[PDB]
């Protein structure tokens, strides 16, 4: 009878992550105490709560929590994808393999991205950054703490993107035309997450993450609606291209100009190595070149989009 | 497949560990980034230590580099040491200007071997003479 | 051929460098091999430090671990420190027995924040009060 | 005309090492001053002379000198081998390729080994070790200095054996039946040299090196005389087997028993980490297991020799 279990496992690949994570949750919840004195508290909840105010430090329990949510997102990917999306697409009368699978991962993209984008916008709304107030980037710099929602979001994004990266490394069967710059994008995204976390400034990271999410949301929506019978995919793509320029390139130039001038056209760049205050001619070039890589790749994607627009409206 | 994943994951985790250790270590021992120990010998084996640094490296850099230099340079098991550390009280903890004058020096310490121990006893005015 | 030679030669030279660095580093900072810093807090933020080690780790281990622990544990840029280091003169430099009694302690030092600075001024009998 | 030069280089492979080393020697000698203020003095002569007495420390100029004599021994190998040995063997009327090349490297073995064995015995004669006085192994332990002749010999052996090791790694064309334990032997020999140097005790190393040299000398002599018309190769091999047991296994058991008991059947094993005095339950196991590896391999070689003796005297 265990052969039927193997068959289910191969057809449905989410049972093992589900089983392990529900074991962790059951053991933690039924433990009686939900305080930090546990270790499952280390693996499930954010650590380093400053006293009992709303502020959190860093450490290694962050990596532990990242690994646990690495498992949770793998489970969610498999379970959601198969169980909900696949029958849903089958009902949508579009019958192929290439198109149906592409739609599969585009609709999964829509789901998590619509979860994340508005959540991040909520996080930014409850901040001094309101609508990308780039002056707060130069408020407290060596801030060794972030608010609860801010950090849980942060690490949620870290865990998710690293999980897509590792699935990419696993090299399942067939990337697709557009893979090399894609893995460049994911690698530099993970480097941006980890660097902008471990160098104490996440205020400068959050706006870019918002831009990425709300761009990819509309991209995936328009792509999957084009893959389905369109009706109005052209207007959706128009909304997408306007939002794409307006948010991605406008906001990224806004951030880059602001960082370069505001943090450079000053006299405040000196080391003072205890207070980790190396917001100077050292950390700047690093994060600057990372952001430049992102923006450069965004321009390349823009050129591709412009080519698509010209080709479509040329015929 | 799997082995490539383990290779790249191990490289990533090694890089993370490398940068975190960089953070921790350089935060602990920063004094040889901003304070420079200038030594001036006296008549015999006894020398004058002080820390000549930037505005940032305050009396922490000074004191830590002096103690480290004393316990580093002079091996005891041949002949025991004797030193004194006299504090500059006319100065606030963080006191250097960025331009290369740096004015007054803060901590300053004398250290030598017991053969000319009388010299260090005389040279240290009243502060406790630490024979180690 | 050539690349295998470079691989093995690089591994050999790396191993040699690793062992030489082991030698040098562990010779420099040995105090956390034989001296163990035992701390006992007083009323407030001020604590009692001393080095509880073996026969080998003499007043070098003691003094180095005390200064390292003081400059390590208490971050100054919030509020400045003030400490004193009182020497045990009734004792020779190398004085511990291997069996776990270790008898008298040697160096011992008090350190705290300026909020209860009066407490450390009182607690240190006459030795110079180092406000850092 | 440079093609003739390439032809000479390929037929005679010692000109490049010769040219580089004579350049170094000429530049050093014609420099006017031969003092330590040079850098060629670092590359050609032993460094760290204690004041001006007969005692030398250690450092990195040791590695530099090792590299230079790595070049010098490569040159000597090629030049000696070809120019002297090959015509000499041709005159000896023994005409083959397998036999002639084996004789080639056995006669080279005889030459350097007869240079080294008596030299090392000279070095031991001018010591407190006289005829392997194993009590001096426990005299001054953390001695950070060695006499001039003692160190120059030491490093000469280090450079030579490492050069044979690297030629072995280069994997020229055809090792030969008996290669795996051979490279085991050379690897453990280099580990013994470097360890017994960098752990401050070379007094315990020298006797073993003497044993190795004076064993290999007679081995190579008897082997090449057997390869040539023998006449009396059997008596030479008898002298070899008696010397082989008497020196290798007897002296190695003498050293091992002495180290184990004398340095262990005592109360003097404590760390005291400044004076590098870790002659204790730490360094002992390391050097002990190294010496055990050597002795074990020597017993295996002994078994092979015993097999040869039985087979030869059985017919
Ligand atoms: C990569 C380059 C590696 C160089 C550093 C690795 C060697 C570590 C030496 C220990 C630290 C040191 O020597 O200085 C110490 C102070 O420690 C340091 O200088 C730095 C701490 C070591 C960790 C450094 C981070 C390692 C990777 C850093 C990235 C390399 C970037 C180089 C240019 C940007 C003084 O020693 P002590 O006797 O005072 O104790
Ligand atoms: C291989 C294992 C590697 C572990 C050591 C490497 C990490 C280096 C850390 C720096 C040294 C340290 O942490 O302790 C330092 C004291 O330094 C040490 O403990 C040892 C010096 C480091 C070099 C060690 C040799 C490296 C290879 C040794 C061979 C490994 C053998 C392990 C079992 C025999 C205290 O730091 P501080 O804040 O006082 O300055």
Curated annotation (Swiss-Prot), chains A, D:
Post-translation changes: Phosphorylated; phosphorylation is induced upon disruption of sphingolipid synthesis. Phosphorylation is inhibited by exogenous addition of phytosphingosine.
Result of changing residue 205 to F: Abolishes the enzymatic activity of the ceramide synthase complex and does not rescue the growth defect of LAC1-LAG1 double deletion mutant
Effect of residue 283 to F: Abolishes the enzymatic activity of the ceramide synthase complex and does not rescue the growth defect of LAC1-LAG1 double deletion mutant
Outcome of substituting residue 278 to A: More than 90% loss in enzymatic activity of the LAC1-LIP1 complex
Catalytic activity, EC: 2.3.1.297
Coiled-coil intervals: none
Gene deletion effect: Does not affect the level of total sphingolipids. Exhibits weak diffusion barriers only in cortical ER and not in the nuclear envelope. Double knockout of LAC1 and LAG1 abolishes growth and leads to mating defects including defects in diploid cell formation, pheromone-induced shmoo formation, induction of cell cycle arrest and activation of mating-specific MAP kinase. Also defective in the localization of STE5 to the plasma membrane.
Membrane topology: Multi-pass membrane protein
A Gene Ontology BP annotation from the UniProt entry: ceramide biosynthetic process
Annotated localization: Endoplasmic reticulum membrane
Pathways involved: Lipid metabolism; sphingolipid metabolism
Known glycosylation sites: 33
List of residues binding fumonisin B1: 99, 102, 112, 161, 185, 216, 219, 223, 226-227, 233-234, 237, 244, 301, 305, 308, 312, 315
Topology feature Cytoplasmic, residues: 86-102, 171-179, 226-235
Glycosyltransferase recorded as keyword: no
The reaction(s) this protein catalyses: a very long-chain fatty acyl-CoA + a sphingoid base = an N-(very-long-chain fatty acyl)-sphingoid base + CoA + H(+); hexacosanoyl-CoA + sphinganine = N-hexacosanoylsphinganine + CoA + H(+); eicosanoyl-CoA + sphinganine = N-eicosanoylsphinganine + CoA + H(+); a fatty acyl-CoA + sphinganine = an N-acylsphinganine + CoA + H(+)
Purpose: Component of the ceramide synthase complex that catalyzes the transfer of the acyl chain from acyl-CoA to a sphingoid base, with high selectivity toward hexacosanoyl-CoA (C26:0-CoA). N-acylates sphinganine and phytosphingosine bases to form dihydroceramides and phytoceramides, respectively. Redundant with LAG1. Facilitates ER-to-Golgi transport of GPI-anchored proteins. Has a lower affinity for phytosphingosine (PHS) than dihydrosphingosine (DHS); PHS is required for the synthesis of phytoceramides and the formation of nuclear envelopes.
Protein name (database record): Ceramide synthase LAC1
Organism: Saccharomyces cerevisiae (strain ATCC 204508 / S288c) (Baker's yeast)
Complete-protein stretch covered: 71 to 385 of 418
From Swiss-Prot, chains B, C:
Organism: Saccharomyces cerevisiae (strain ATCC 204508 / S288c)
Topology of the protein relative to the lipid bilayer: Single-pass type II membrane protein
Similarity comment text for this entry: Belongs to the LIP1 family.
Outcome of swapping residue 33 to R: Does not affect LAC1-LIP1 complex formation but abolishes enzymatic activity
Outcome of mutating residue 34 to A: Does not affect LAC1-LIP1 complex formation but abolishes enzymatic activity
Stated name of the protein: Ceramide synthase subunit LIP1
Transmembrane region(s): 3-22
Binding site for hexacosanoate: 22
Organism ancestry: Eukaryota, Fungi, Dikarya, Ascomycota, Saccharomycotina
Entry domain remark: The C-terminal domain probably plays a role in its function.
